[PDB]
Amino acid sequence: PLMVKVLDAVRGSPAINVAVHVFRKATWEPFASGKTSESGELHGLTTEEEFVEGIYKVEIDTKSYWKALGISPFHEHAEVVFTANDSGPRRYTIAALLSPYSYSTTAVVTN
Amino acid sequence: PLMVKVLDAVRGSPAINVAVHVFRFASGKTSESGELHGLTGIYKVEIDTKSYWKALGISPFHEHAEVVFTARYTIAALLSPYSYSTTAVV
Amino acid sequence: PLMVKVLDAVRGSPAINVAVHVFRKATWEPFASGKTSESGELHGLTTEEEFVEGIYKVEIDTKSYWKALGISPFHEHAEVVFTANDSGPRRYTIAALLSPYSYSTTAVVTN
Amino acid sequence: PLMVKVLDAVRGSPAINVAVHVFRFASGKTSESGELHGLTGIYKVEIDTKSYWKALGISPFHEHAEVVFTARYTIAALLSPYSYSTTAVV
Numbered sequence: 001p002l003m004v005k006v007l008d009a010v011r012g013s014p015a016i017n018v019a020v021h022v023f024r025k026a027t028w029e030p031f032a033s034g035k036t037s038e039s040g041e042l043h044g045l046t047t048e049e050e051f052v053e054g055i056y057k058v059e060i061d062t063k064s065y066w067k068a069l070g071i072s073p074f075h076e077h078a079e080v081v082f083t084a085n086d087s088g089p090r091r092y093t094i095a096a097l098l099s100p101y102s103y104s105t106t107a108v109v110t111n
Numbered sequence: 112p113l114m115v116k117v118l119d120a121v122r123g124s125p126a127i128n129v130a131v132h133v134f135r136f137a138s139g140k141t142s143e144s145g146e147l148h149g150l151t152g153i154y155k156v157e158i159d160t161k162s163y164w165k166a167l168g169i170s171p172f173h174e175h176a177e178v179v180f181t182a183r184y185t186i187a188a189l190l191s192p193y194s195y196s197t198t199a200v201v
Numbered sequence: 202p203l204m205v206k207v208l209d210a211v212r213g214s215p216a217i218n219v220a221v222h223v224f225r226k227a228t229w230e231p232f233a234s235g236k237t238s239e240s241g242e243l244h245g246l247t248t249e250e251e252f253v254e255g256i257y258k259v260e261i262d263t264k265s266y267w268k269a270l271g272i273s274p275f276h277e278h279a280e281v282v283f284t285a286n287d288s289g290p291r292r293y294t295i296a297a298l299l300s301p302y303s304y305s306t307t308a309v310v311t312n
Numbered sequence: 313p314l315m316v317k318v319l320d321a322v323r324g325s326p327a328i329n330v331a332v333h334v335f336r337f338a339s340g341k342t343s344e345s346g347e348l349h350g351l352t353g354i355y356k357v358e359i360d361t362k363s364y365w366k367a368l369g370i371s372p373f374h375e376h377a378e379v380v381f382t383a384r385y386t387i388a389a390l391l392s393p394y395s396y397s398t399t400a401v402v
């Protein structure tokens with residue numbers, strides 16, 4: 001139900017081993033977290049049972065990622081905050097593209 | 112020293128009258144050119160994209176666009192209903 | 202060796218049935234073309250045998266796509282032009298994100 | 313009526329002295345603020361991103377950024393070595 005995919009615009013590659021923290025609005029309660037794979041993807045964050053309606057924030061730790069590659073980051077993280085499952089359960093993929101001074105995110109939502 | 116600019120990728124225009132709150136702090140609403148001047152460590156710029164889309168009658172994915180960075184800075188955000196990108200020019 | 206993936210930022214979905222034309226620099230010679238799947242992906246454009254070094258242009262037909270959905274497009278197409286395989290064969294994925302008045306593309310290149 | 317603006321997403325700055333050729337037509341190189349004024353159906357704006365990156369000592373993926381559209385227009389391009397995004401504001 002919640003997938004994150006991250007690409008690196010500086011290296012021309014997936015963004016590998018990037019930390020992703022998901023929080024749910026209670027204050028922001030920790031909900032789920034993970035690290036992207038060698039494909040830049042993070043599956044297994046959560047389950048249909050755990051993924052309730054509410055306001056979720058996904059924070060992708062772009063600062064650590066760039067610092068580990070030896071690159072100066074501008075942002076602390078790339079984030080996405082969205083209301084989930086309000087009219088019914090859905091599946092969300094958050095796709096992100098990273099550069100040191102810019103990031104882009106989009107959502108794909110399926111029923 | 113800190114400017115915010117907001118653009119609409121659907122209609123190809125500035126995003127007018129968008130609420131922008133800066134934390135660490137400053138706030139405003141965007142002008143007819145999509146810019147917010149005169150707002151004024153680690154800063155958060157929270158752009159009320161949900162109200163912008165809903166005024167247009169478009170269902171948007173995000174609650175807001177929040178951009179968090181360490182500190183003359185221009186923070187631009189390009190909006191679509193299910194995406195946003197943001198840039199810093201310094 | 203050459204994959205294209207396309208997402209729609211207006212609908213929150215893959216960009217389905219979008220035409221993609223690839224040309225190689227001779228004038229631009231037709232090289233390969235296809236349409237994205239229900240996942241927004243286009244596999245099977247070309248083969249390791251056919252994919253030689255050279256300058257390639259990938260043109261994604263964003264105008265037809267938006268017109269078919271009833272949306273006014275600004276661009277004629279989203280394009281990407283790049284030198285391929287110069288220091289050796291590689292695999293290229295071109296990922297694109299579409300809005301009516303904007304598009305983004307990135308490349309993932311693997312050996 | 314037609315402005316071009318080019319920004320660098322790696323260094324967080326305008327892209328200075330970039331060659332831009334418009335077809336249908338006009339050409340120029342970007343200024344210290346990354347803008348090209350005074351350039352002046354279907355138009356192509358070809359931005360020489362490869363020369364920009366190679367002057368910085370960075371190997372870039374694209375040959376150029378070419379943006380083709382049907383026609384006051386601002387065409388912005390945000391550059392990274394393996395990506396570019398482009399916006400039209402009208």
Ligand SMILES: O=C(O)c1ccc(-c2cccnc2)cc1
Pocket residue numbers: 005007095096097104105106206207208241296297298305306307
């Ligand atoms: O289909 C995909 O895997 C995929 C497609 C496009 C992106 C993408 C492109 C540009 C900006 N942001 C995200 C990311 C992933």
Ligand SMILES: O=C(O)c1ccc(-c2cccnc2)cc1
Pocket residue numbers: 116118187188189196197198317319386388389390397398399
């Ligand atoms: O200053 C501007 O006009 C301007 C600033 C930023 C962008 C932009 C942002 C994200 C992706 N692509 C382009 C575009 C234009």
Ligand SMILES: [Ca+2]
Pocket residue numbers: 053085086087088
């Ligand atoms: Ca509900």
Ligand SMILES: [Ca+2]
Pocket residue numbers: 254286287288289
């Ligand atoms: Ca060679």
